Amino acid sequence: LDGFRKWYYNAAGFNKLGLMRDDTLHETEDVKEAIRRLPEDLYNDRMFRIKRALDLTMRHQILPKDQWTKYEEDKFYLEPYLKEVIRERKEREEWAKK
Amino acid sequence: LDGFRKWYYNAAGFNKLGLMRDDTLHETEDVKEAIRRLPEDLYNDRMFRIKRALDLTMRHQILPKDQWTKYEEDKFYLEPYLKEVIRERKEREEWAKK
Amino acid sequence: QDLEFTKLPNGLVIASLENYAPLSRIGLFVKAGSRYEDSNNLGTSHLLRLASSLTTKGASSFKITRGIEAVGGKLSVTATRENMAYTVEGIRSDIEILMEFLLNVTTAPEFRRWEVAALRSQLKIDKAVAFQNSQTRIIENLHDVAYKNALANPLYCPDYRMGKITSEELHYFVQNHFTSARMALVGLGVSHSVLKQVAEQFLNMRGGLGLAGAKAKYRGGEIREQNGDNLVHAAIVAESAAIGNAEANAFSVLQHLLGAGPHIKNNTTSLLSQSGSHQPFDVSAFNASYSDSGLFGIYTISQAAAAGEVINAAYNQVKAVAQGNLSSADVQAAKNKLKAGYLMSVETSEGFLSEIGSQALAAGSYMPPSTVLQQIDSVADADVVKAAKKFVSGKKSMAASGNLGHTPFLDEL
Amino acid sequence: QDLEFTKLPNGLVIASLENYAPLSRIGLFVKAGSRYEDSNNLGTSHLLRLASSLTTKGASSFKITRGIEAVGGKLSVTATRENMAYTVEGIRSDIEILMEFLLNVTTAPEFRRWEVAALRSQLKIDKAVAFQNSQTRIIENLHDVAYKNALANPLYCPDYRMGKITSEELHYFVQNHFTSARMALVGLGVSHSVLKQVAEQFLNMRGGLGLAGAKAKYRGGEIREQNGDNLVHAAIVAESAAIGNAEANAFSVLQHLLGAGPHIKRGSLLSQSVAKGSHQPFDVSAFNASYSDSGLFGIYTISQAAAAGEVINAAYNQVKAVAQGNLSSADVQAAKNKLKAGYLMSVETSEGFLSEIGSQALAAGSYMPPSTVLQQIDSVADADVVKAAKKFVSGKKSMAASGNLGHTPFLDEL
Amino acid sequence: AARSGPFAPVLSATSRGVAGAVPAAPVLDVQAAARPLVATVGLNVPASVRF
């Protein structure tokens, strides 16, 4: 399962643009709240990575293979911050339900 | 000529609706400038006068005769200022031709 | 019955009174005022005071707000330069979760950075609302010119420090001043046992004595700020006794002799107020005593023009009291005014809870209202005179604001 | 052509020098600084300084601005706490209309209310630009804590007074301080005669002595501004000599002995006394500001907040050594050479020469040839310097501090 | 002048008149005296000044 997940990570292809996994999340309301709660350095790296991926998609290029994002290396930075947004979101929802 | 004037005055009617000559000057660029320069009191007064007129027109009604303006009472509040706006305006213009 | 005060072995004071009130109040008192900051973390206590509804380790923000409003209870934070007090009140059937919320807020905050970044604008708004009146600004200026290090720190955050207070400063302040030896948990309308039992779930984390605060040093100085207000709010104070010293009382009797604000909704209500008078002006005596130092002086509001001699007249009246020119009936009336003010201050429930709280942190003991009455009586005429001479001689500190073209200086005063 | 200083009967002090220069310069000097206001019209001189391009009785704002820029000339206003100076400069063939514009601005303003209402936002912008650096705020704070009434008034308008300064206050200030007995018209590159003709068509109508200002009173004190800057700025001064005494020359020799700016790029008894104990970056100098009734002399320090204390102490200790006679005659001779070279390089430029003549005019009504001064500075002698020092080390001090002041000492500790 | 040394532009101000930039240099719903300040704030109750 670990090797097949690495193969699927190579087949997804966002590592060839230098992106992380959390860069590829669709910005819903909860995702934008989690992005707003990021520290300044992580937010700046995320915006630069997104801008570089957009430039590479503009020129129809990819990064060199040494510059790709290694599956093992990818960091799920937004995840911790996101869970909270969802948790808080649900708590609020439940309160209203009841 | 006063007879003529006073007569025309009553004929114009701006008096009936409690409005001095100045109150009835179209707001061209220059007039607008002078209006701004107006000391606040005259401005606020001007406004009530105009607002009042509007209300009366709404009801297709005129003020009680007594309240009507008087050819003599009518003061030109903006005239002194307007001239300046025009003077300054012209000066800038001639200088343009220089 | 009466209050009960067990001192726990980690230093926490527990005080309880069960009077079977329908609404019961529970407060927690910490020696963590603005005097414990230095020049590197100014305004941290203001953000800590405004950060009482932030997601705590135990409870998320939503709950800490929706749960207090669900039972209709109230959570408030009152802060002096020495002490902070977090108070909750509500129906007896909901004070268990009210103590859960309050003790979570006191003991286990999280101080998330996005929450404090949202709170700094509220800090600016709260400071503007607080400085909408001239007294607050002139008392903050008076403390800033009167003291050097400790009590000179403002209750409200400075303008440059907004945007600069971090989560680490709040965490450091809480970890260095919210320890069990500086805390008293006081409950009116609750059983002592539960307070003891709610003192174990929390208030057990930090058992230290906290990072003690520097000794406050007097500096003197007069600051005048032209602000335009037709009224020259001027406060002239000097160093006075600490809370504990016997001299303290003497200074309280001295302000009630000189005038402590009007008692009617406005004349001949003060030696000061009496001292000629043909204009609209307010004159009172100011006294603020903290556990190491005190400020006593005069406070004047007047028309800018007369601002001078009115201040002089008020000053001259105190000099008369410094020369022994007083009557025993006046001192007896001052004592009656002071003791009636104390009894009406403790007649309300939140004032009673604050008093017990303060006494706890200050002396660890409860002083029955009765005891005080006889101690105030202890103050005698000469004692009052003495405190006066202290003010009349000690270096003065002057905070002035308004159109100060005719406001005198300290070397002229 | 030595300045033909001449005092017209009214009081105007006309002075001129036909240097046959390509670009001339004509200035007019009025004793109407910020010291002549009181608590009711604070900041009026700032709006008067910024209101030089307003509509006058004789030329509109458009005509003044487009006519000065049409010939490429320059109109500027420089203001101290005592004096205001309106200066125009341009080609000799256009200085007739330049004097028309300048004398209209000085003598016959209109001060229309919509123009000053538009100018108050520029007043706020100018104050923010001026207080962008720490030295300006700390000197304004130092004057405010040092004096009681006259010289304590700020050069820049207070925040509450913006939106409150009216046309009537400007008219009252002009009518009470812009009179002929307080004015000198100084022209480099012009004939003296023309100055006089323009001095009769203008500058002769307002001829009272005007409104006399109050005597400045010293108070002492210390005002501190905790604002979290990287560097602590601190000025500690005391009362000193006024304009018109030899003790002012002694105090000028004393600041050039203690240190009055680097002669070399990137780099003084003070500087030596600080640098022998502190390896942090610093900047210690001597401050002297003397006005016609009173003067301030002291030390100015910029340092890291942490060392701010002992550095200040070290600087103070150095002055105490000078108060104990611990000085050498070669050091005083070098200080005199530095002071006289600074004076000659200050008057070597045309606008500095015009300002100097102007100041001398208003101050003493006479022109003092650069040479004369040189021998008077020489008059100052070693003991004299020591004397001024003891005045500083004894007189009550006034302290303005700003920065992270957790380790900045107080006056009773200093 | 002579006195200016290196503090001239500080004791003097010069408007340009005619010949870093300014860095972009609220309203809240609106006596007695001398009772030491004790600011209070609450979760529900609005904050207040006890001057």
Side-chain angles (χ1 to χ4, degrees):
Chain A
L1 183 63
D2 179 78
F4 173 60
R5 276 202 159 125
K6 293 181 176 67
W7 175 83
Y8 184 90
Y9 182 81
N10 290 318
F14 53 87
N15 59 330
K16 303 177 179 177
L17 312 170
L19 289 171
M20 295 296 172
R21 188 206 62 181
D22 291 331
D23 306 332
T24 65
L25 294 176
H26 176 45
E27 295 191 17
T28 67
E29 311 297 274
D30 291 331
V31 182
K32 291 174 71 175
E33 293 294 328
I35 281 155
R36 183 180 63 83
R37 292 178 189 191
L38 285 171
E40 183 178 1
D41 62 358
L42 284 185
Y43 173 100
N44 289 329
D45 308 350
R46 177 188 175 270
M47 295 299 291
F48 170 67
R49 278 197 307 274
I50 286 172
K51 192 180 167 69
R52 185 178 49 179
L54 288 158
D55 173 77
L56 283 162
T57 304
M58 182 179 72
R59 56 191 75 254
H60 289 291
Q61 295 297 109
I62 55 175
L63 283 183
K65 186 180 289 293
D66 57 80
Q67 281 178 273
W68 287 349
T69 303
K70 304 188 191 58
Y71 166 78
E72 51 279 5
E73 299 175 344
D74 184 350
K75 61 178 182 62
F76 301 154
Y77 64 96
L78 189 58
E79 177 190 5
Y81 297 103
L82 186 54
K83 305 175 180 302
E84 185 63 17
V85 180
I86 314 300
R87 156 189 300 94
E88 300 178 356
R89 193 274 303 271
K90 292 306 181 59
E91 182 181 25
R92 301 190 307 272
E93 288 186 344
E94 168 278 342
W95 187 284
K97 305 179 186 188
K98 76 173 188 299
Chain B
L1 181 53
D2 181 24
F4 206 98
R5 300 310 187 91
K6 284 184 160 59
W7 184 94
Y8 183 86
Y9 204 100
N10 306 353
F14 57 110
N15 49 3
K16 304 174 185 174
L17 308 178
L19 299 172
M20 301 185 182
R21 181 196 71 181
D22 297 2
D23 297 332
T24 67
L25 299 171
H26 176 92
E27 289 188 342
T28 79
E29 312 296 290
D30 301 3
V31 176
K32 292 169 54 181
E33 272 292 358
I35 293 179
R36 171 190 56 89
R37 290 175 177 174
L38 284 172
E40 181 174 1
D41 60 334
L42 301 184
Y43 182 91
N44 292 351
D45 298 359
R46 180 177 180 271
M47 301 306 300
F48 181 75
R49 296 194 301 274
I50 293 184
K51 184 175 180 58
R52 186 171 58 183
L54 290 182
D55 185 297
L56 306 159
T57 300
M58 171 190 56
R59 51 190 81 269
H60 289 301
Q61 288 286 176
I62 57 180
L63 291 168
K65 184 172 304 305
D66 58 340
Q67 310 173 181
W68 291 13
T69 309
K70 298 188 186 58
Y71 180 91
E72 47 278 2
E73 297 175 343
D74 180 4
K75 66 177 182 62
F76 304 138
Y77 54 87
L78 196 56
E79 178 169 356
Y81 299 106
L82 186 54
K83 305 175 179 302
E84 185 63 17
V85 180
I86 314 300
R87 156 189 300 95
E88 300 178 356
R89 193 274 303 271
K90 292 306 181 59
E91 182 181 25
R92 293 189 303 278
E93 290 182 336
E94 181 285 334
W95 178 264
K97 301 180 177 182
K98 278 299 193 303
Chain C
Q1 188 173 355
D2 52 4
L3 279 292
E4 183 178 2
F5 286 69
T6 74
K7 190 181 298 287
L8 297 193
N10 60 345
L12 173 83
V13 183
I14 295 293
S16 165
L17 167 64
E18 175 63 84
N19 47 0
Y20 303 101
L23 284 198
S24 62
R25 187 181 310 271
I26 292 162
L28 188 153
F29 290 76
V30 184
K31 302 193 193 73
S34 72
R35 82 185 310 277
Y36 299 102
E37 310 164 342
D38 63 358
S39 304
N40 299 293
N41 57 352
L42 280 180
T44 317
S45 56
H46 189 192
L47 197 63
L48 178 61
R49 157 163 88 252
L50 294 176
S52 58
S53 61
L54 288 187
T55 294
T56 58
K57 290 211 283 293
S60 58
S61 293
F62 181 86
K63 184 174 54 181
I64 310 184
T65 300
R66 294 290 186 101
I68 295 177
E69 280 173 77
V71 307
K74 179 177 75 173
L75 163 73
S76 69
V77 174
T78 187
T80 69
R81 276 164 166 85
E82 292 179 353
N83 295 316
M84 273 176 102
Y86 298 178
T87 311
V88 76
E89 62 86 20
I91 301 97
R92 299 173 66 89
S93 300
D94 309 313
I95 62 170
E96 293 83 3
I97 63 170
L98 293 186
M99 293 182 286
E100 294 293 328
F101 283 149
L102 180 135
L103 275 162
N104 265 320
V105 160
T106 61
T107 57
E110 269 171 71
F111 294 131
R112 294 168 177 192
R113 66 185 183 273
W114 46 94
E115 294 190 336
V116 306
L119 267 177
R120 288 181 299 222
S121 56
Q122 187 51 239
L123 189 88
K124 180 188 178 180
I125 289 170
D126 172 87
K127 199 217 188 178
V129 164
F131 284 171
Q132 262 181 7
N133 60 336
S134 310
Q135 185 179 15
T136 314
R137 319 193 298 280
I138 202 78
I139 294 300
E140 294 294 329
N141 274 336
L142 186 72
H143 273 89
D144 183 67
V145 66
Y147 287 98
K148 273 187 183 177
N149 56 4
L151 296 161
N153 292 332
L155 285 176
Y156 304 101
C157 178
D159 304 0
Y160 79 99
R161 281 289 286 152
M162 185 186 324
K164 283 185 183 177
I165 308 175
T166 68
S167 301
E168 277 79 31
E169 298 170 0
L170 291 157
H171 271 295
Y172 189 85
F173 197 82
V174 163
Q175 284 158 17
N176 281 280
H177 306 101
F178 275 68
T179 81
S180 297
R182 319 152 63 106
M183 291 201 275
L185 181 70
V186 166
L188 302 181
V190 69
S191 69
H192 188 112
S193 61
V194 299
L195 292 182
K196 287 181 299 184
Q197 89 181 8
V198 299
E200 52 78 22
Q201 43 173 6
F202 310 95
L203 308 179
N204 49 346
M205 325 291 301
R206 289 167 296 271
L209 315 175
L211 182 46
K215 182 64 70 177
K217 301 196 294 293
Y218 194 81
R219 59 173 275 182
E222 53 173 348
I223 54 182
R224 305 151 56 91
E225 36 276 1
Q226 262 72 351
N227 65 19
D229 310 344
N230 313 354
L231 307 178
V232 175
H233 292 255
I236 297 104
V237 295
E239 206 176 6
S240 84
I243 294 184
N245 320 333
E247 191 177 15
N249 283 178
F251 270 111
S252 282
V253 169
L254 181 52
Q255 65 181 356
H256 273 94
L257 169 66
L258 285 179
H263 294 90
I264 297 84
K265 184 184 187 184
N266 55 359
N267 289 284
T268 299
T269 41
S270 298
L271 310 185
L272 305 176
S273 285
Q274 272 168 336
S275 308
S277 169
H278 304 265
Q279 293 191 6
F281 67 95
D282 190 328
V283 185
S284 72
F286 176 77
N287 186 26
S289 54
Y290 320 96
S291 71
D292 51 344
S293 172
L295 295 178
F296 177 76
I298 53 166
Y299 189 85
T300 55
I301 308 162
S302 62
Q303 301 294 348
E309 69 275 15
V310 175
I311 283 170
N312 276 318
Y315 191 61
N316 286 321
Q317 184 45 244
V318 191
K319 297 211 260 199
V321 176
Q323 290 149 1
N325 297 121
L326 57 85
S327 57
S328 293
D330 266 318
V331 187
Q332 197 56 243
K335 286 186 198 191
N336 291 335
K337 282 185 262 193
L338 169 66
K339 70 174 60 172
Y342 173 64
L343 288 180
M344 296 157 200
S345 73
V346 305
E347 81 170 3
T348 182
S349 79
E350 61 86 20
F352 192 38
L353 185 136
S354 169
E355 173 75 9
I356 302 171
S358 305
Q359 293 181 355
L361 293 191
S365 175
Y366 180 88
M367 207 190 169
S370 59
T371 54
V372 182
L373 295 174
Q374 80 192 356
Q375 80 176 346
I376 297 172
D377 297 351
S378 308
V379 177
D381 289 14
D383 309 343
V384 186
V385 186
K386 177 176 304 180
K389 62 186 50 59
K390 193 177 189 304
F391 167 74
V392 84
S393 60
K395 182 165 59 180
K396 312 284 194 296
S397 307
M398 182 171 184
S401 82
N403 201 298
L404 310 165
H406 308 280
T407 307
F409 293 86
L410 281 187
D411 62 358
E412 316 161 346
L413 195 155
Chain D
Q1 305 85 358
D2 48 350
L3 288 312
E4 310 179 13
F5 202 102
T6 63
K7 192 185 314 300
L8 293 189
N10 50 5
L12 192 64
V13 296
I14 300 300
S16 172
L17 157 55
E18 178 50 34
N19 54 11
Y20 298 97
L23 300 176
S24 68
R25 199 181 286 264
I26 292 162
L28 188 153
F29 290 76
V30 184
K31 302 193 193 73
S34 72
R35 82 185 310 277
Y36 299 102
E37 310 164 342
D38 63 358
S39 304
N40 299 293
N41 57 352
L42 280 180
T44 317
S45 56
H46 189 192
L47 197 63
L48 178 61
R49 157 163 88 252
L50 294 176
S52 58
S53 61
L54 283 197
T55 303
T56 65
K57 291 196 299 294
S60 54
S61 313
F62 179 80
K63 202 188 114 176
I64 282 162
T65 317
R66 294 290 186 101
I68 295 177
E69 280 173 77
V71 307
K74 178 177 75 173
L75 163 73
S76 68
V77 173
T78 187
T80 69
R81 276 163 165 85
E82 293 179 353
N83 295 316
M84 273 176 102
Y86 298 178
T87 310
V88 76
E89 62 86 20
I91 302 97
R92 299 173 65 89
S93 300
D94 309 313
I95 62 170
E96 293 83 3
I97 63 170
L98 293 186
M99 293 182 286
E100 294 293 328
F101 283 149
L102 180 135
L103 275 162
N104 265 320
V105 160
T106 61
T107 57
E110 268 171 71
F111 294 131
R112 294 168 176 192
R113 66 185 183 273
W114 46 94
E115 294 190 336
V116 306
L119 267 177
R120 288 181 299 222
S121 56
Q122 187 51 240
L123 189 87
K124 180 187 178 180
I125 289 170
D126 172 87
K127 199 217 188 178
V129 164
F131 284 171
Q132 262 181 7
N133 60 336
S134 310
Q135 284 91 355
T136 314
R137 319 193 298 280
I138 202 77
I139 294 300
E140 294 293 329
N141 274 336
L142 186 72
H143 273 89
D144 183 67
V145 66
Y147 287 98
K148 273 187 183 177
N149 56 4
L151 296 161
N153 292 332
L155 285 176
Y156 304 100
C157 178
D159 304 0
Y160 79 99
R161 281 288 286 152
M162 304 174 191
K164 283 185 183 177
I165 308 175
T166 68
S167 301
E168 277 79 31
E169 299 170 0
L170 291 157
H171 271 295
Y172 189 85
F173 197 82
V174 163
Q175 284 158 17
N176 281 280
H177 306 101
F178 275 68
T179 81
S180 297
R182 319 152 63 106
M183 292 201 275
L185 181 70
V186 166
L188 302 181
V190 69
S191 69
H192 188 112
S193 61
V194 299
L195 295 174
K196 294 178 292 187
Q197 71 201 12
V198 305
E200 59 78 22
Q201 58 170 7
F202 298 106
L203 287 187
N204 66 339
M205 294 300 293
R206 267 202 300 268
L209 310 185
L211 203 61
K215 182 64 70 177
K217 301 196 294 294
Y218 194 81
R219 50 176 288 191
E222 46 186 8
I223 54 185
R224 294 146 79 89
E225 294 293 329
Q226 173 94 33
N227 52 3
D229 291 331
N230 292 66
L231 297 166
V232 166
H233 292 239
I236 297 104
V237 295
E239 206 176 6
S240 84
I243 300 299
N245 312 312
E247 216 176 11
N249 290 122
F251 270 111
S252 282
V253 170
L254 181 52
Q255 65 181 356
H256 273 94
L257 169 66
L258 285 179
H263 282 68
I264 300 79
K265 183 183 184 184
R266 305 187 183 92
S268 305
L269 312 182
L270 305 176
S271 285
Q272 272 168 336
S273 308
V274 171
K276 72 173 71 175
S278 312
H279 49 273
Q280 289 293 287
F282 66 96
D283 192 80
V284 185
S285 72
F287 176 77
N288 186 26
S290 54
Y291 319 96
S292 71
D293 51 344
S294 172
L296 295 178
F297 177 76
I299 53 166
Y300 189 85
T301 55
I302 308 162
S303 61
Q304 302 294 348
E310 69 275 16
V311 175
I312 283 170
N313 276 318
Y316 191 61
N317 286 321
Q318 184 45 244
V319 191
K320 297 210 260 199
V322 176
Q324 289 149 1
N326 297 121
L327 57 85
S328 57
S329 293
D331 266 318
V332 188
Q333 197 56 243
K336 286 186 198 191
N337 291 335
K338 282 185 262 193
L339 169 66
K340 70 174 59 172
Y343 172 64
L344 288 180
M345 296 157 200
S346 73
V347 305
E348 81 170 3
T349 182
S350 79
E351 61 86 20
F353 192 38
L354 185 136
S355 169
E356 173 75 9
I357 302 171
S359 305
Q360 293 181 355
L362 293 191
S366 175
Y367 180 89
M368 207 190 169
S371 59
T372 54
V373 183
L374 294 175
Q375 80 192 356
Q376 80 176 346
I377 297 172
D378 297 351
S379 308
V380 177
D382 289 14
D384 309 343
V385 186
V386 186
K387 177 176 304 180
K390 61 186 51 59
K391 192 177 189 304
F392 167 74
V393 63
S394 59
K396 183 190 183 69
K397 312 284 194 296
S398 307
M399 182 171 184
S402 82
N404 201 299
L405 310 165
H407 309 280
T408 307
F410 293 86
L411 281 187
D412 62 358
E413 316 161 346
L414 195 155
Chain E
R3 298 297 182 271
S4 297
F7 311 97
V10 175
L11 309 167
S12 308
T14 299
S15 67
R16 300 193 305 178
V18 283
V22 162
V27 181
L28 310 161
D29 172 28
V30 52
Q31 295 180 352
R35 297 292 180 85
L37 296 174
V38 189
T40 303
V41 305
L43 166 58
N44 43 5
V45 170
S48 59
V49 297
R50 312 213 307 271
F51 42 86

